[PDB]
Amino acid sequence: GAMGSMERASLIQKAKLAEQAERYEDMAAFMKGAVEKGEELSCEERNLLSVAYKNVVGGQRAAWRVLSSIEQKSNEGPEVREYREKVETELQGVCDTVLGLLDSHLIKEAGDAESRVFYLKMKGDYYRYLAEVATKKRIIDSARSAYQEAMDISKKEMPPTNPIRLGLALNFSVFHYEIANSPEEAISLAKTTFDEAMADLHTLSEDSYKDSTLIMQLLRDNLTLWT
Amino acid sequence: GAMGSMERASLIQKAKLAEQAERYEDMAAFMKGAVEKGEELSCEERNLLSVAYKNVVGGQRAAWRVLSSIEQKSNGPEVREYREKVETELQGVCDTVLGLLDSHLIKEAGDAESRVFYLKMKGDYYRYLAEVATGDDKKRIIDSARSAYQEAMDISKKEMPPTNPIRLGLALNFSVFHYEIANSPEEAISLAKTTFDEAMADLHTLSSYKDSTLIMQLLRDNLTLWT
Amino acid sequence: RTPSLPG
Amino acid sequence: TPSLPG
Ligand SMILES: *N1CCC[C@@H]1[C@@H](c1ccccc1)c1cccc(OC)c1
Ligand SMILES: *N1CCC[C@@H]1[C@@H](c1ccccc1)c1cccc(OC)c1
Ligand SMILES: [Cl-]
Ligand SMILES: [Cl-]
Ligand code: NA
Ligand code: NA
Ligand code: NA
Ligand code: NA
DSSP string of B46-68? HHHHHHHHHHHHHHHHHHHHHHH
Tell me the C-alpha distance between A42 and B61, whole Å. 32
Cis (ω within 30 of 0) for the bond into A176?
Answer: no
**Which helix H or strand E contains A223, and what residues bound it?**
helix A206-226
List Cβ neighbours of A206 (8 Å cut-off, separation of 6 or more). none
Residue A95 in contact with residue A129, Cβ under 8 Å?
yes
Q: Please give the DSSP secondary-structure letter assigned to residue A3.
A: T
Tell me the C-alpha distance between A194 and A166, whole Å. 8
Residue B178 in contact with residue B185, Cβ under 8 Å?
yes
Tell me the C-alpha distance between B146 and B153, whole Å. 10
Tell me the C-alpha distance between B36 and B31, whole Å. 9
Number of residues assigned to chain B: 227
CB within 5 A of ion ligand 7: which residues? A 224
Tell me the C-alpha distance between B149 and D4, whole Å. 14
Burial of A135 (0-12, 13-18, 19+ CB in 10 A): exposed
Nearest alpha carbon to residue A189 among A165, A211, A213: A165
Nearest alpha carbon to residue B56 among B20, B34, B81, B29: B29
Q: Report CB contact under 8 Å: B226, D3.
A: no
Q: Which residue of A has its CA nearest to B80?
A: A14
Interface residue B136 vs chain A (CB under 8 A): no
Tell me the C-alpha distance between B195 and A44, whole Å. 55
Cα A28 to averaged position of ligand 5 atoms, centre (Å): 18
Phi then psi dihedrals of residue A21, to 5 deg: -90, 5
* Angle (CA) A188 A190 A194, round 5°: 115
Cα B57 to averaged position of ligand 8 atoms, centre (Å): 28
Q: Report CB contact under 8 Å: B218, D1.
A: no
Q: Which residue of A has its CA nearest to B85?
A: A26
Method: X-ray
List Cβ neighbours of A24 (8 Å cut-off, separation of 6 or more). A18, A51, A52, A55, A56, A59
User: Sign (positive/negative) of CA torsion B21, B22, B24, B25?
Assistant: negative
Which residue ranges form the domains of chain A, and what is each CATH number?
Answer: 1-227 (1.20.190.20)
**Which helix H or strand E contains B19, and what residues bound it?**
helix B8-20
Cβ atoms within 10 A of the Cβ of A14, count? 25
List Cβ neighbours of B59 (8 Å cut-off, separation of 6 or more). A22, B24
CA A97 vs. chain centroid, Å, equals: 13
Tell me the C-alpha distance between B156 and B105, whole Å. 17
Tell me the C-alpha distance between A13 and B83, whole Å. 13
Report CA-CA distances (Å) from C7 to A51, A52, A53, B123.
6, 10, 10, 42
Tell me the C-alpha distance between B24 and B21, whole Å. 8
Number of residues assigned to chain C: 7
CA B205 vs. chain centroid, Å, equals: 29
Tell me the C-alpha distance between B8 and B23, whole Å. 19
Burial of A39 (0-12, 13-18, 19+ CB in 10 A): exposed
Residues in chain A closer than 8 A to C4 (CB atoms): 125, 170-171, 174
Residue B157 in contact with residue B124, Cβ under 8 Å?
no
List Cβ neighbours of A124 (8 Å cut-off, separation of 6 or more). A143, A144, A146, A147, A150, A168, A171, A172, A175
Report CA-CA distances (Å) from B41 to A45, B23, B24, B31, B44.
48, 21, 19, 10, 8
Declared resolution, Å: 1.5
User: Which of A51, A215, A225 lies nearest to residue C2, judging by beta carbons?
Assistant: A225
Phi then psi dihedrals of residue B153, to 5 deg: -60, -45
List Cβ neighbours of A88 (8 Å cut-off, separation of 6 or more). A64, A133
Residue A52 in contact with residue A24, Cβ under 8 Å?
yes
Report CA-CA distances (Å) from B154 to B7, B140, B150, B180, B186.
36, 21, 6, 22, 20
Residue D2 in contact with residue B176, Cβ under 8 Å?
yes
Tell me the C-alpha distance between A131 and A200, whole Å. 34
List Cβ neighbours of A220 (8 Å cut-off, separation of 6 or more). A190, A194
**Which helix H or strand E contains A198, and what residues bound it?**
helix A183-200
Tell me the C-alpha distance between B186 and B194, whole Å. 12
Nearest alpha carbon to residue D5 among A98, B222, A1: B222
Nearest alpha carbon to residue A220 among A191, A199, A198: A191
